[PDB]
């Protein structure tokens, strides 16, 4: 990312409907206010200001021209292929860029005279949906959300202006920092002068000149102290007394701040220098940090914005057992063979199952299906928990022998009553086994397919009830009917999917009050409640009210599908507000987004949390935008996310403008790569590349793909395209290897030319998740001091099966290393030149360090890969850098369906050359130790990974449906066993795959 995870060893101290690509010349029908249609022949890359000037040059030919107004009095409008009408204000816009459908433009004068109000509905562009498809949804929840959410927006925008310049700078450019101030002791010892050497630079242009000033300073020395010691150096002189010196390194100390050279980071916050991620990376990597003194003036100058606007009876006291009337589905699909039928299976659900649910009388297995039934479910009404859901489906099996969900309560607290029509979802993919409650399917009319008509009981105006009535369930615990070791807080230490016995549920519920002392058991306690008793539940609500806080790691478990209750979740969200820091927030940002899918209502606590941070910390804003936009094509979540995105875009500020550049750029890529993938461009590399380059030369492309930021890391600016360096990585679905000059003031100067793969084909999501988990393991490791070095390269899903992957320079697949060097008929595995390959590159005392790196990384992966049971690794999955480091690419297939990384002899040899076998060398002994520490370490933090995976269940990912998929990882980490027990299990698996323990 910064370098290329490259260690310096022994440094010591254009479109239209139906058509992909409009012809270089089309005929566009212009339509004027005099009624006369002219037909202009336009170059596809032409501005509207150029087509307009033409139209009005051609106008003088066309009679009734005496009616035509001044050129600068009109605006083009047309139908875009998102089926909308759009006034084309930004007439800079190129023909091929205006999404267009049919090649026509229609002249008209600026109606709505708030030019600037409609401009801003750009946004739909960033969102990928017109901000007016919202201006039309009947559902009041929606219209309320859009209105009621702007508080947060107003709040965020305030929390940025309050502190005038610095605050914004700090919104944009948040400090990039590891969240522990304490520095690992295997890093500290790479330091072990106690401190570090940095090189702080000053530009003195238009003399162009850049001057270094090398300091050897404290590792914990804050940036203000660094700027000081730097200005001491620069200003020290034979003419300044040390007193005179001191009042200069002062009277201009704080006119400056620090900037990482070559990208866009800024240390702007009192923190130990080594707590910033850049510095700590520079250490591990054996590099001398280069920072730049930047005049606050010249920073604070860059940042504009500050723009924000916004142009827009009874109770549970009921005495009847819930019934629901099932009428009729109007559509189905099959027509009879034998033991086949249809019937609406119904359930009342809170996460999983209260009440013995009900399948209604099976009638007519095909012909127009009536039921006209009532369904008595055996629970009271006052017993219904807030968030109880009607779960239904239709599917059948073999009756004799051989889908949709609904919130029972409004977002309003109102119990749902009367007529309801429910368009149903097509059954999933690994599902008939169920009735399906997991379904996002919660609150869910679809579009036009199978449609159930419903009827809910009715008894004069109904709603839920202030925590006033609720709290007043003291009544119950002041019931004492006394006519009848505690060594069980062991089961706090127990993974979430451990599945507990009814016997234990009773027990925990019994000693419920003696857990406000052992707060981390709350999840288990919450599982223990019989949720169909208004009695137990109301007591719960009250423990929860003043429950002690919990670590965000544990407090996240309460956000998955299993905890669907406004009261539970609020506490959860308040734990995250309490102590879950911007750092660890963007580690877990994916999961936190996904979880939003089971949030019952649009407006709610978690969204407001997220939206606010995203609007506070622009680094979070970026991935929050992208992680949401990525899934806008998925109609089960579109409206929610679209709506979330609109509020976000309406308040993020200048950043919006950046994000559209990003989005236009990705639009172009998706369209180009399409042509090559489809449109019979299955010709040949040579031909294709011909096409590739011709196209990227057109000025529409040149403009779209040049001045933007890397969705993979927006710190990295992307300047002009290297072009000569751009190729269809072909060798697949046609991925594009792209190359950008890094426009930084100290660009090549001091660190890079920018590179990235755009792939239009694979579903990047799983890869994305697994790279995330690798990082997380890597973090467990570094802190625990037990140094192993993974390489979780960047990987961003940006839409339906489309994304960017980070290039890592100077790295090769084992296969590559093997072909590079050798004759013969045999492979030899280049057991030589995959070690000899490492002997070269790393000649000298360098060698040892390179063998070490390999060994570390190799062990790292070896474990990570076994734990997660991924791909199944061969010689084009496994990659080594000159550097020494090993790392896995293209994990692909996730959680298995055992031991994917079998250590070939090639890798054994690399652990310094041993003769007849190397199964017993002291290099290998050293190695085994690491693995056992690595597996045992991740073991210690298992519940975390269970959660992370579990929070990730709301997402298509055919690899993750059920908790029983997460079961694999439960097995692999040791089921019931002890530490020293499972340690043995792991070995049994090491030996079984290697043929040599």
């Amino acid at each position: 990312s910064y370098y290329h995870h490259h260690h310096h060893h022994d440094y010591d101290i254009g479109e239209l409907w139906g058509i992909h690509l409009m012809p270089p010349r089309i005929l566009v029908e212009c339509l004027l206010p005099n009624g006369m249609i002219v037909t202009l022949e336009c170059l596809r890359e032409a501005t509207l200001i150029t087509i307009k000037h033409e139209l009005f040059k051609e106008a003088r030919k066309y009679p009734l021209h005496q009616l035509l107004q001044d050129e600068s009095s009109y605006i083009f409008v047309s139908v875009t292929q998102e089926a909308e009408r759009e006034e084309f204000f930004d007439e800079t816009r190129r023909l091929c860029d205006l999404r267009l459908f049919q090649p026509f433009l229609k002249v008209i004068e600026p109606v709505g005279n708030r030019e600037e109000k409609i401009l801003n509905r750009e946004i739909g562009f960033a969102i990928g949906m017109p901000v007016c498809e919202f201006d039309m949804v009947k559902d009041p929840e929606v219209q309320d959300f859009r209105r009621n959410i702007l508080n947060v927006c107003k709040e965020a925008v305030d929390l940025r202006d309050l502190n005038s310049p610095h605050s914004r700078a700090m919104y944009v450019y948040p400090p990039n920092v590891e969240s522990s101030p304490e520095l690992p002791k295997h890093i500290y010892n790479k330091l072990d002068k106690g401190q570090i050497i940095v090189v702080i630079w000053v530009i003195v242009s238009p003399n162009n000149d850049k001057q270094k000033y090398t300091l050897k300073i404290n590792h914990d020395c804050v940036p203000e102290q660094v700027i000081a010691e730097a200005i001491r150096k620069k200003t020290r002189s034979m003419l300044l007394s040390s007193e005179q010196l001191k009042l200069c390194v002062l009277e201009y100390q704080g006119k400056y701040i620090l900037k990482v050279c070559g990208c866009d980071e800024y240390f702007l916050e009192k923190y130990p220098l080594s707590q910033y991620k850049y510095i700590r990376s520079c250490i591990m990597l054996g590099r001398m940090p280069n920072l730049m003194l930047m005049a606050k003036e010249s920073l604070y100058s860059q940042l504009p914005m500050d723009c924000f606007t916004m142009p827009s009876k009874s109770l549970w006291v009921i005495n009847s057992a819930l019934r629901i009337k099932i009428l009729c589905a109007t559509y189905v699909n099959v027509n009879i063979r034998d033991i086949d039928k249809i019937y609406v299976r119904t359930g009342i659900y809170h996460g999983g199952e209260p009440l013995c649910d009900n399948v209604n009388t099976q009638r007519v297995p095909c012909s127009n299906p009536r039921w006209n039934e009532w369904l008595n479910y055996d629970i009271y009404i006052p017993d219904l928990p807030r968030a109880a859901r009607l779960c239904l489906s239709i599917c059948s099996v073999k009756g004799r022998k051989g889908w949709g969900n609904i919130n029972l309560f409004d977002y309003t607290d109102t119990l749902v009553s009367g007529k309801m029509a429910l368009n149903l979802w097509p059954v999933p993919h690994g599902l008939e086994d169920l009735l399906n409650p997991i379904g996002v399917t919660g609150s869910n009319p679809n579009k036009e397919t199978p449609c159930l008509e419903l009827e809910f009981d009715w008894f004069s105006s109904v709603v839920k009830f202030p925590d006033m009535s609720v709290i007043e369930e003291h009544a119950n615990w002041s019931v004492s009917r006394e006519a009848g070791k505690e060594q069980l807080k062991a089961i706090s230490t127990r993974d979430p999917l451990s599945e507990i016995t009814e016997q234990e549920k009773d027990f925990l519920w019994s000693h419920r009050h003696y857990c406000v002392t052992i707060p981390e058991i709350l999840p288990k306690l919450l599982l223990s409640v019989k949720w169909n008793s208004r009695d137990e539940v109301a007591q719960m609500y009250c423990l929860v009210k003043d429950w002690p806080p919990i670590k965000p790691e544990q407090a996240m478990e309460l956000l998955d599908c299993n905890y669907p209750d406004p009261m539970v979740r609020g506490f959860a969200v308040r734990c995250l507000e309490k102590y879950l820091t911007d750092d660890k927030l963007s580690q877990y940002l994916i999961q936190l987004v996904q979880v939003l899918k089971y949030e019952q209502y649009l407006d709610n606590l978690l969204v407001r949390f997220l939206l606010k941070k995203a609007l506070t910390n622009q680094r979070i804003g970026h991935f929050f935008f992208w992680h949401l936009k990525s899934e806008m094509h998925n109609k089960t979540v579109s409206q929610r996310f679209g709506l979330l995105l609109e509020s976000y875009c309406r308040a993020c500020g200048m950043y919006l403008k950046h994000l559209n550049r990003q989005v236009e750029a990705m639009e172009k890529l998706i369209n180009l790569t399409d042509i090559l993938k489809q449109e019979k461009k299955d010709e040949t590399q040579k031909v294709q590349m011909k096409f590739l380059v011709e196209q990227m030369r057109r000025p529409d492309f040149m403009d779209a793909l040049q001045g933007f930021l890397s969705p993979l890391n927006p710190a990295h600016q992307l300047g002009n395209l290297r072009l000569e360096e751009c190729r269809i990585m072909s060798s697949a679905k046609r991925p594009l290897w792209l190359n950008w000059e890094n426009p930084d003031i100290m660009s090549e100067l001091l660190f890079q030319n920018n590179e990235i793969i755009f792939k239009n084909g694979d579903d990047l999501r799983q890869d994305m998740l697994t790279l995330q988990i690798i990082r997380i393991m890597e973090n467990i490791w570094q802190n625990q001091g037990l140094d192993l070095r993974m390489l979780p390269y960047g990987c961003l899903s940006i839409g339906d099966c489309v994304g960017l992957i980070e290039v890592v320079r100077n790295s090769h697949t084992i296969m590559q290393i093997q072909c590079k060097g050798g004759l013969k008929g045999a492979l030899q595995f280049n057991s030589h030149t995959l070690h000899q390959w490492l002997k070269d590159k790393n000649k000298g005392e360098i060698y040892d360090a390179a063998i070490d790196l390999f060994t570390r990384s190799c062990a790292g992966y070896c474990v990570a890969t076994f734990i997660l049971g991924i791909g199944d690794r061969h010689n084009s999955n496994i990659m080594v850098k000159d550097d020494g480091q090993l790392f896995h690419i293209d994990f692909g297939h996730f959680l298995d369906h055992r031991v994917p990384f079998v250590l070939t002899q090639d890798f054994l040899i690399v652990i310094s050359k041993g003769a007849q076998e190397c199964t017993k060398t002291r290099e290998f002994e050293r190695f085994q130790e690491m693995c056992y520490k690595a597996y045992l370490a991740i073991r210690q933090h298992a519940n975390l990974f269970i959660n992370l995976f579990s929070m990730m269940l709301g997402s298509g990912m055919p690899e993750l449906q059920s908790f029983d998929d997460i079961a694999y990882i439960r097995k692999t980490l040791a089921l019931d066993k002890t530490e020293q027990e499972a340690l043995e299990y792991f070995m049994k698996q090491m030996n079984d795959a290697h043929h040599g323990g």
Partner: protein, 139 residues
């Protein structure tokens, strides 16, 4: 092997002749759905477009009539003639659409007919599991 022999193995590769035909029938199913929704948003696009070309020839009414050389002419003759080509484009789209629906329903039918059959042959394998160890799975 005693009762029903290794006859439960020929039952397994056959099992995939439909287990995979599910997967392949499903993607066809998933593909065709978007295909439809593409066609459907395309028609609204058509609509508003059609909608726009009336608003034009009806602008050169009381605005062109305010005179009736005179040959402010062939423009109107063809402004109609294009509308023809659009209404018939949309017309063509429409019939292409419900065919794809009739197709969609068909793909749905055959999938909600294999599923139980595919599942009834699932556990017959799993139940009779006990009938170096592990050898029958491979091939």
């Amino acid at each position: 092997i005693e009762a029903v022999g290794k006859k439960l193995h020929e039952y397994n590769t056959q099992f995939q002749e439909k287990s995979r035909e599910y997967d392949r029938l499903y993607e066809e199913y998933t593909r065709t759905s978007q295909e439809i929704q593409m066609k459907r948003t395309a028609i609204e696009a058509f609509n508003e477009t059609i909608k726009i070309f009336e608003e034009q020839c009806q602008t050169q009414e009381r605005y062109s009539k305010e005179y009736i050389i005179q040959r402010i002419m062939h423009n109107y003759d063809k402004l109609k003639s294009r509308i023809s080509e659009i209404i018939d484009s949309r017309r063509r789209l429409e019939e292409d659409l419900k065919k794809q629906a009739a197709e969609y329903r068909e793909i749905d039918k055959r999938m909600n007919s294999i599923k139980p059959d595919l599942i009834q042959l699932r556990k017959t394998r799993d139940q009779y599991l006990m009938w170096k160890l592990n050898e029958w799975l491979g091939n």
